[PDB]
Curated annotation (Swiss-Prot), chain A:
It comes from the Eukaryota. Belongs to the RNA polymerase beta chain family. Catalytic core component of RNA polymerase II (Pol II), a DNA-dependent RNA polymerase which synthesizes mRNA precursors and many functional non-coding RNAs using the four ribonucleoside triphosphates as substrates. Pol II-mediated transcription cycle proceeds through transcription initiation, transcription elongation and transcription termination stages. RNA binds at residue 144. It comes from Homo sapiens (Human). This is DNA-directed RNA polymerase II subunit RPB2. Component of the RNA polymerase II (Pol II) core complex consisting of 12 subunits: a ten-subunit catalytic core composed of POLR2A/RPB1, POLR2B/RPB2, POLR2C/RPB3, POLR2I/RPB9, POLR2J/RPB11, POLR2E/RPABC1, POLR2F/RPABC2, POLR2H/RPABC3, POLR2K/RPABC4 and POLR2L/RPABC5 and a mobile stalk composed of two subunits POLR2D/RPB4 and POLR2G/RPB7, protruding from the core and functioning primarily in transcription initiation. Part of Pol II(G) complex, in which Pol II core associates with an additional subunit POLR2M; unlike conventional Pol II, Pol II(G) functions as a transcriptional repressor. It is found in: Nucleus.
Swiss-Prot record, chain B:
A zinc finger (TFIIS-type) spans 82-124. PROSITE patterns: RNA_POL_M_15KD (PS01030), ZF_TFIIS_1 (PS00466), ZF_TFIIS_2 (PS51133). This is DNA-directed RNA polymerase II subunit RPB9. Zn(2+) 1 binds at residues 17, 20, 39, 42. InterPro entries: DNA-dir_RNA_pol-M_15_CS, Rpa12/Rpb9/Rpc10/TFS, Zn_ribbon_RPB9, Zn_ribbon_RPB9_C, Znf_TFIIS. The keyword Metal-binding applies. Its main location: nucleus. The modification N-acetylmethionine is found at residue 1. The gene is POLR2I. The keyword Transcription applies. Component of the RNA polymerase II (Pol II) core complex consisting of 12 subunits: a ten-subunit catalytic core composed of POLR2A/RPB1, POLR2B/RPB2, POLR2C/RPB3, POLR2I/RPB9, POLR2J/RPB11, POLR2E/RPABC1, POLR2F/RPABC2, POLR2H/RPABC3, POLR2K/RPABC4 and POLR2L/RPABC5 and a mobile stalk composed of two subunits POLR2D/RPB4 and POLR2G/RPB7, protruding from the core and functioning primarily in transcription initiation. Part of Pol II(G) complex, in which Pol II core associates with an additional subunit POLR2M; unlike conventional Pol II, Pol II(G) functions as a transcriptional repressor. It comes from the Eukaryota. It comes from Homo sapiens (Human). Keywords: Acetylation, DNA-directed RNA polymerase, Metal-binding, Nucleus, Transcription, Zinc, Zinc-finger. Pfam families: Zn_ribbon_RPB9, Zn_ribbon_TFIIS.
Curated annotation (Swiss-Prot), chain C:
The gene is GTF2F1. It is found in: Nucleus. Belongs to the TFIIF alpha subunit family. It comes from Homo sapiens (Human). Its main location: nucleus. The keyword Glycosyltransferase does not apply. The keyword Phosphoprotein applies. GO terms for molecular function: DNA binding; phosphatase activator activity; promoter-specific chromatin binding; protein domain specific binding; protein phosphatase binding; RNA binding; RNA polymerase II general transcription initiation factor activity; RNA polymerase II general transcription initiation factor binding. Heterodimer of an alpha and a beta subunit. Interacts with GTF2F2, CTDP1, TAF6/TAFII80 and URI1. Interacts with GTF2B (via C-terminus and preferentially via acetylated form); this interaction prevents binding of GTF2B to GTF2F2. The modification Phosphothreonine is found at residue 114. Keywords: Acetylation, DNA-binding, Nucleus, Phosphoprotein, Transcription, Transcription regulation. Induction: Up-regulated in response to enterovirus 71 (EV71) infection. This is General transcription factor IIF subunit 1.
Length: 147, 125, 138
C-alpha cells in the first residue's frame, strides 16, 4: 500500500485486497475493472489539507494536475472488490464529529455523495426529494429533449 | 461413566501405509479377535488403537472457538468495543462478530476476540 | 564463546573456472530417506516411451532399493539466484551457481496392478464388492 501510494506502481491498475478471515492476499492487474477515486484518511484525521487546495487555486496559471494530487497520496483509486473491505465514511463532518459515535476506524472518505449519480441523473435538481422511479423516468426523457 | 462427559474419541481419519504411503482400511482378524488396518495394494498391516472406524453427526459441534483466527482482530470493518475485560489479560477493547457462516445454526450469540498482542484469546459470552 | 561477544568472518569466493553444472535433489523429510543405507545408485534420463529436456530416474541399490522420478523446477527465478555455499579447509566460503532444480519422488517396487486384464470392466460391475481377490488372481 505504501508502494502504491508512492506511485512506484500504477494505481487504478494494481488493485489489492486482503481477506483477513481466510488468511489470503489477492492482487489484480487485468483490464476492465471498474474503480473510483477516494480521499484517504489516516489514524482518525483526513489526509488532504489546505496547502493542496492552495495549489489547486494557483493551478489557474501555475503548473499543477490531478496527477500531482494523487502523487501526494491523499487520494486513491478503489475497485469494487477492495471496496468490500474498506471502512468508508460519508463526510469529513462525521469523521471529525465522531466522539461518541459507534465507529472509529474509517479508512477512506467520499469527495462528495452527489458523485454516485450518472450523467443524466445529474441534470435533475434535488433528486433526493423525488420518489426514485420518478427520477428514472427523467433520465430517460432528458435524452429526448431538444436544444 | 458420567453425564458430564464428552465424545471426542479421536476420529483418526488419517493413518497411511508406512511403505506405499496410501490409506489403511479396516479388516477382520478372526484368529486374533482384533481389528487390523491394512493397505489394499500391499501386505503391510498394523493393529488399530481404537474400536471406532466411523462416526457421523454430533449435530452440535457448535464449533464456536475454532477456525476463527486471532488475527481477525486487525480488520478495520469490525466493531471495536468499549466493553471491557479479556478474560485472560487485564486489558479492555475487543473486536466482536457473529456466525459469519452458512450452517448459521441460528447462533445469534456474539463472539469476542481480544486485540492486544498478549493473548489473541478467543472467548464467547 | 557463542553466548558472548563472538565474531567470525569468512572469505567468500565465486570461481569461474568450474565446468560442472550444479543441481538440487530434493526429498520429503516425511519420506525418511537414509543415505547411510544407499550402497549403490543409478541416475539416468528416462522417457523411453516418448537428453537435456528429460526427467531423471534415480535408482538406489538396484532391485533391492527405492526408485525415484526427477522433475524440473517450475521456472527460473525473476529477481534472485539460489547459490550453494561450501566450507573450505583454508577457512573461506565457496559459492556455486545452481543450474537447475529437480524434484525426486517415490516410485514403488514390484507391485504391478495392471488394469488391462478386465479391471476397467470389473470396475463397471464394481460395487466396492471385492478388493483382495482380484489382486491375487493376476
Ligand atoms: Zn500399503
Ligand atoms: Zn487478552
Amino acid at each position: 500500500r505504501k508502494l502504491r501510494r508512492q506511485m512506484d506502481i500504477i494505481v487504478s491498475e494494481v488493485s489489492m485486497i486482503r481477506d483477513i478471515r481466510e488468511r489470503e492476499i489477492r492482487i489484480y492487474t487485468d483490464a476492465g475493472r471498474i474503480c473510483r477515486p477516494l480521499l484517504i484518511v489516516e489514524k482518525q484525521k483526513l489526509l488532504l489539507k489546505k496547502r493542496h487546495i492552495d495549489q489547486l487555486k494557483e493551478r489557474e496559471y501555475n503548473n499543477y494536475s490531478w496527477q500531482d494530487l494523487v502523487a501526494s497520496g491523499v487520494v486513491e483509486y478503489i475497485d469494487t472488490l477492495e471496496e468490500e473491505t474498506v471502512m468508508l465514511a460519508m463526510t469529513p463532518d462525521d469523521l471529525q464529529e465522531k466522539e461518541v459515535a459507534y465507529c472509529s476506524t474509517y479508512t477512506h472518505c467520499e469527495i462528495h455523495p452527489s458523485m454516485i449519480l450518472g450523467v443524466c441523473a445529474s441534470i435533475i435538481p434535488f433528486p433526493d426529494h423525488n420518489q426514485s422511479p420518478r427520477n428514472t423516468y427523467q433520465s430517460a426523457m432528458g435524452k429526448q429533449a431538444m436544444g | 461413566m458420567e453425564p458430564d462427559g464428552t465424545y471426542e474419541p479421536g476420529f483418526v481419519g488419517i493413518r497411511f501405509c508406512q511403505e506405499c504411503n496410501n490409506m489403511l482400511y479396516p479388516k477382520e482378524d478372526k484368529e486374533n479377535r482384533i481389528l487390523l488396518y491394512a493397505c489394499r495394494n500391499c501386505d503391510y498391516q498394523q493393529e488399530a488403537d481404537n474400536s471406532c472406524i466411523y462416526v457421523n453427526k454430533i449435530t452440535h459441534e457448535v464449533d464456536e472457538l475454532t477456525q476463527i483466527i486471532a488475527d481477525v482482530s486487525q480488520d478495520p470493518t469490525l466493531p471495536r468495543t468499549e466493553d471491557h475485560p479479556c478474560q485472560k489479560c487485564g486489558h479492555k477493547e475487543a473486536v466482536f462478530f457473529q456466525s459469519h457462516s452458512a450452517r448459521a445454526e441460528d447462533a445469534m450469540r456474539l463472539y469476542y476476540v481480544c486485540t492486544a498482542p498478549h493473548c489473541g484469546h478467543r472467548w464467547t459470552e | 564463546g557463542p553466548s558472548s561477544q563472538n565474531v567470525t568472518e569468512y572469505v567468500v569466493r565465486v570461481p569461474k573456472n568450474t565446468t560442472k553444472k550444479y543441481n538440487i535433489m530434493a526429498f520429503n523429510a516425511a519420506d525418511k530417506v537414509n543415505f547411510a543405507t544407499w550402497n549403490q545408485a543409478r541416475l539416468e534420463r528416462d522417457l523411453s516411451n516418448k537428453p537435456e529436456d528429460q526427467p531423471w530416474l534415480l535408482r538406489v541399490n538396484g532391485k533391492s532399493g527405492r526408485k525415484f522420478k526427477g522433475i524440473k523446477k517450475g521456472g527460473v527465478t525473476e529477481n534472485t539466484s539460489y547459490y550453494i555455499f561450501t566450507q573450505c579447509p583454508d577457512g573461506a566460503f565457496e559459492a556455486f551457481p545452481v543450474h537447475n532444480w529437480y524434484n525426486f519422488t517415490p516410485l514403488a517396487r514390484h507391485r504391478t496392478l495392471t488394469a488391462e486384464e478386465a479391471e476397467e470392466e470389473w470396475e463397471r460391475r464394481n460395487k466396492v464388492l471385492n478388493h483382495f481377490s482380484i489382486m491375487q488372481q493376476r
